[PDB]
């Protein structure tokens, strides 16, 4: 029993982190086979960040301008190119610790673990969700860019995020590993703001199921609702619409507990309309939306990674 | 910016996890040099758990009765002994992945990361605190015993917890790596209950400082208090006493922010007496007590591990 915001084991990703320095600037890179992936703004000076011409700044860099270190060990750069907002530095040594891996572009609502790093070394690991406004609520400081977000499925690490920047309110934005930003953001120090966020309804329902599984059942009521009528309430409280696909994805937890998804929807409707009146669910005073259905099942069934 | 419940990178500990099977029962072990540490109740059958005589059950086991596997690879057991509530299985192969490590007995109030494991494989990592009642609020299922809790300082893993059992309310109990339980518990399926818990006052203050550092300052008031008068309020709300040592330990965060510890105490006093009136601090609707002063500084300054 118990339910925690649980991150993936980070060892496979730790073996891939390196330091990338270009002149003054040092940030993190990801070393897979003989390629190091890092944010392209490593090539910028504190002078011009308001709007760099990255393509131009890069023509004036050569391989030797990039100091890549894996721990103590320098890795010689033997080629370089830019793909959208990331640099790919070909090095003379393939990482012997390269896990089985894929690059994925996650969808808003999905979760992943961030391995926060500085100077190529890990500081810590935590779980996040890609928010509907394409930000993540992370914890990042100067020097953290190039830190990555990932999922693990058995033996395969799916890299889905690389960290690039921090928006007003202290939320964070970044790219997939092909260097394409999530959301309408770019890597320039200009006036950018996240869109209004929304609550990930299907994840809240998944967490309510997690609560029932753990014995925290006080919020279950006797009623049901239709999908359409539920979504009218969701909208008012800035919850995203629940689709039939969401309902189907909740099927395993619904089956395990015997609580139809629409019955759980009626219980969530009442929580939105009436609040929690000082009670908690799974120790929380607010409704939690950063556990997917798969996260709940993984944690409550003990899924492990090879 | 941002502030997250952050766990230590788990790679050093992952390389140490193994599966230990004795007859039916399989749980996790920790493989350091040529010794595997695991909970002694691996030698029990589902028949007698209400009160095993472990010393007796062990005399009838020989080395070959223990199947130890590190991934696919069997490790031959060449000796065995019991130390309090853990078994030490000497094996014929030293773990080549053994990190620099120590065994520590943590104090209530301190935090550590748990690497939850099943069948010798990691499921996930999360941060916990040793509660004043010597429990942790973890997430554990059948088969998770032998999962360990740890801190990292530079290159050194301090192992402080091994998981043994779950108490009513869904809280968890275990031992240090010398097999001595934290708290008044034992490894027998009998009526055991945690004592009444209390809130870790010094950690709440540390988190309030973390909030100020992140710009969330609405709860700061203009007043101060004495240590003695603050502790009278703390007591009423089931907060542990704040000592001068606690004040001194908060010195770095007090210096960084310019807010005297006793000024922050006056602000916490007001939160306890008046509540938060629907506001949040660092995204939370409740006061958080599972960040130590060192955790806050580590996260807000980017401390990394070699
Ligand atoms: C990479 N190491 C840092 C990570 C930032 C730094 C503080 N916390 C973070 O997550 N990334 C940057 O410094 C990027 C970088 C230029 C400036 N920048 C920002 O994150 C800035 N934000 C924005 O410009 C805004 F508001 F548009 F998001 C800053 C104001 C410094 C936080 C480039 C190339 C975007
Ligand atoms: C080790 N793999 C499990 C972990 C438990 C199992 C469910 N969630 C956990 O953390 N440990 C046990 O099964 C231990 C073991 C006997 C029974 N046990 C318990 O945790 C039981 N608890 C107690 O007896 C109580 F209440 F005293 F804490 C159980 C009721 C099965 C949860 C021994 C040797 C303690």
Curated annotation (Swiss-Prot), chains A, B:
Reported effect, residue 189 to A: Does not affect ability to cleave and inactivate human TRMT1
Active site: 41 (for 3cl-pro activity), 145 (nucleophile)
Phenotype for residue 49 to A: Does not affect ability to cleave and inactivate human TRMT1
Activity regulation as described: Inhibited by pyridone-containing alpha-ketoamides compounds 13a and 13b. In turn, alpha-ketoamide 13b (tert-butyl (1-((S)-1-(((S)-4-(benzylamino)-3,4-dioxo-1-((S)-2-oxopyrrolidin-3-yl)butan-2-yl)amino)-3-cyclopropyl-1-oxopropan-2-yl)-2-oxo-1,2-dihydropyridin-3-yl)carbamate) inhibits SARS-CoV-2 replication in human lung cells. Inhibited ex vivo by michael acceptor inhibitor N3. Inhibited ex vivo by compound 11a and 11b.
Subcellular localization: Host cytoplasm; Host Golgi apparatus; Host nucleus
Residue stretches making up the Peptidase C30 domain: 1-306
Cross-link Glycyl lysine isopeptide (Lys-Gly) (interchain with G-Cter in ubiquitin), where in sequence: 5, 90
Reaction catalyzed: TSAVLQ-|-SGFRK-NH2 and SGVTFQ-|-GKFKK the two peptides corresponding to the two self-cleavage sites of the SARS 3C-like proteinase are the two most reactive peptide substrates. The enzyme exhibits a strong preference for substrates containing Gln at P1 position and Leu at P2 position
Cytoplasmic side: 1-306
Function statement: Cleaves the C-terminus of replicase polyprotein at 11 sites. Recognizes substrates containing the core sequence [ILMVF]-Q-|-[SGACN]. Cleaves and inactivates human TRMT1, preventing tRNA guanine(26)-dimethylation of tRNAs. May cleave human NLRP1 in lung epithelial cells, thereby activating the NLRP1 inflammasome pathway. May cleave human GSDMD, triggering alternative GSDME-mediated epithelial cell death upon activation of the NLRP1 inflammasome, which may enhance the release interleukins 1B, 6, 16 and 18. Also able to bind an ADP-ribose-1''-phosphate (ADRP).
Subunit structure: 3CL-PRO exists as monomer and homodimer. Only the homodimer shows catalytic activity. Interacts with host FBXO22; this interaction promotes the proteasomal degradation of nsp5.
Stated name of the protein: 3C-like proteinase nsp5
Organism, as annotated: Severe acute respiratory syndrome coronavirus 2 (2019-nCoV)
